[PDB]
């Protein structure tokens, strides 16, 4: 029976069969979540470029890294950002399904330096659920904040 779970830890130390990188559309290393991911799976950055609202898988040995590009809300309108954020999660669901994995480690896309300085915990998490509800993978959501951990945990709890 597939679960959602949340872990307050470095996604680069995930115990899942594949990882989602919070990527830039240029396929560049970056800083934060992308940094740790670059350090752990640097070969996965070969031709990792993919447009905003898309996801592209690059293998690191046999370990899949799914580079998912949420929108930078600084650059987008609220309505266009929302569309691109939903689309990115949909493409994650497709790659997870295509790869046949039993589990996936996923961050909340567009909630850090791409948030346009807004709290998008609820917006981003609900787009993740919409996409991942049609898959059979165990989903483990990674965050850093102690609060976010609690709010994500409660939103998981009150669907079950
Ligand atoms: C995960 O939190 C973010 O703000 C974020 N989301 C992305 O979808 N791509 C990124 C790329 C570089 C930096 C941050 C991001």
């Amino acid at each position: 029976a597939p679960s959602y779970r949340v872990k307050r830890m470095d996604i680069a130390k995930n115990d899942e069969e594949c990882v989602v990188n919070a990527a830039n559309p240029r396929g560049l290393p970056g800083d934060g979540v992308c940094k740790a991911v670059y350090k752990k799976w640097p070969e996965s950055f070969k031709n990792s470029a993919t447009p905003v609202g898309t996801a592209k898988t690059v293998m690191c040995g046999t370990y899949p890294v799914i580079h998912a590009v949420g929108p930078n809300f600084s650059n987008y309108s609220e309505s266009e950002g929302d569309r691109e954020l939903a689309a990115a999660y949909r493409e994650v669901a497709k790659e997870v399904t295509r790869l046949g994995v039993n589990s996936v480690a996923i961050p909340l896309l567009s909630t850090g330096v791409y948030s346009g300085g807004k709290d998008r915990l609820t917006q981003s998490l609900n787009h993740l659920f919409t996409a991942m509800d049609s898959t059979d993978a165990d989903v483990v959501i990674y965050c850093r904040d102690k609060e976010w951990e609690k709010k994500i945990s409660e939103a998981i709890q009150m669907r079950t």
Side-chain angles (χ1 to χ4, degrees):
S3 68
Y4 292 98
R5 292 162 52 217
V6 54
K7 273 153 73 174
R8 187 177 93 94
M9 58 180 276
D10 186 354
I11 200 169
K13 287 175 161 87
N14 78 76
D15 187 47
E16 290 65 60
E17 296 190 349
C18 73
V19 71
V20 173
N21 179 37
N24 65 69
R26 312 254 144 188
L28 287 184
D31 304 81
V33 161
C34 210
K35 168 202 246 167
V37 174
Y38 184 70
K39 250 174 179 217
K40 199 65 61 180
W41 301 290
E43 27 277 286
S44 77
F45 282 73
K46 183 183 207 134
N47 296 310
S48 59
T50 195
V52 171
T54 79
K56 189 178 189 225
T57 299
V58 186
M59 308 297 291
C60 176
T62 76
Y63 189 84
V65 178
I66 305 163
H67 297 272
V69 182
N72 185 351
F73 276 91
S74 294
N75 300 338
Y76 278 88
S77 81
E78 282 295 334
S79 73
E80 272 307 314
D82 186 71
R83 185 140 14 248
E84 295 297 4
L85 181 57
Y89 280 117
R90 238 172 282 128
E91 292 228 347
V92 170
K94 176 168 181 186
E95 293 299 302
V96 168
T97 302
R98 196 186 54 78
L99 293 161
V101 285
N102 298 312
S103 66
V104 54
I106 193 168
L108 296 183
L109 299 179
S110 297
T111 62
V113 299
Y114 276 24
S115 70
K118 248 132 200 277
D119 182 324
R120 288 182 196 275
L121 184 161
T122 296
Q123 182 182 19
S124 188
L125 180 63
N126 285 336
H127 282 321
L128 185 161
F129 287 151
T130 294
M132 300 311 297
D133 278 351
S134 65
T135 79
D136 11 29
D138 282 321
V139 174
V140 186
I141 304 163
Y142 286 79
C143 64
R144 302 320 316 261
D145 231 287
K146 257 184 269 163
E147 315 281 47
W148 282 47
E149 180 181 12
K150 204 180 223 209
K151 295 197 178 141
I152 298 164
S153 197
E154 285 171 25
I156 289 167
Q157 287 295 294
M158 60 203 313
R159 336 172 68 206
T160 49

